[PDB]
Design a protein around this ligand. Structure first.
Ligand SMILES: [Cl-]
Ligand SMILES: [Cl-]
Length: 207
């Protein structure tokens, strides 16, 4: 299993590598600079945030996480296990999200997932353990690795927007080939695909 690649501290090297693909050379120059992501000091809390916010507006997502933070002991595994399913519903969580949050907390206290020690674990091992939680599939696990843990080399082949972008920009090409070239910077490449979609949604000119 590939060794864990550290988060980027700057994007200069990444953009030069990606810019070897003339499609990304254009996309990166049209979209400009993207902020450098810092790996979270609290993977558990960031997982709960992600789960809680799913399908909600940005303001609603922040609000509900704020209500979780307000429960006794906050967004900490042992504390969350002492809150009733009824009081978790009470903060506004769907039953599906209650079950996911309880399952994640339970996995933390039982040692099934060691959220304090993810940094040494290869992407696929972290993914496999997250996937075993109800309501967390591969896509959610991969989004977590990319955005929460700031891992540099994640291409989520289940992300509709990424796949549509590759289809659009590289018609007739094998996506596995296209995206392999971007390694070891598939996460930044993905973020530039999402940025390009947002650019097009704002009225931008196509490639
Ligand atoms: Cl909800
Ligand atoms: Cl998922």
């Amino acid at each position: 299993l590939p060794a864990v690649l550290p988060p980027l501290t700057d994007h200069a090297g990444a953009v030069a590598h990606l810019s070897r693909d003339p499609v990304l050379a254009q996309v990166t120059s049209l979209c400009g600079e993207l902020p450098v992501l810092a790996p979270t000091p609290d993977p558990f809390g960031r997982l709960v945030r992600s789960v809680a916010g799913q399908q909600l507006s940005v303001k609603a997502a922040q609000a509900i996480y704020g209500r979780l933070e307000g429960l006794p002991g906050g967004v900490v595994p042992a504390a969350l296990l002492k809150v009733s399913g009824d009081d978790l519903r009470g903060v506004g969580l769907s039953w599906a999200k209650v079950r996911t949050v309880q399952a994640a907390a339970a996995a933390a206290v039982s040692g099934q997932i060691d959220f304090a020690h993810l940094s040494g674990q290869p992407d696929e091992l972290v993914i496999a353990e997250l996937v075993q939680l109800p309501g967390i599939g591969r896509w959610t696990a991969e989004m977590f690795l990319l955005f929460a843990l700031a891992r540099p080399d994640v291409f989520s082949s289940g992300d509709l927007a990424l796949r549509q972008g590759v289809e659009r920009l590289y018609p007739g090409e094998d996506w596995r080939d296209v995206t392999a070239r971007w390694a070891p910077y598939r996460s930044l490449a993905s973020r530039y695909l999402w940025a390009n979609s947002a650019r097009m949604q704002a009225g931008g000119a196509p490639l």
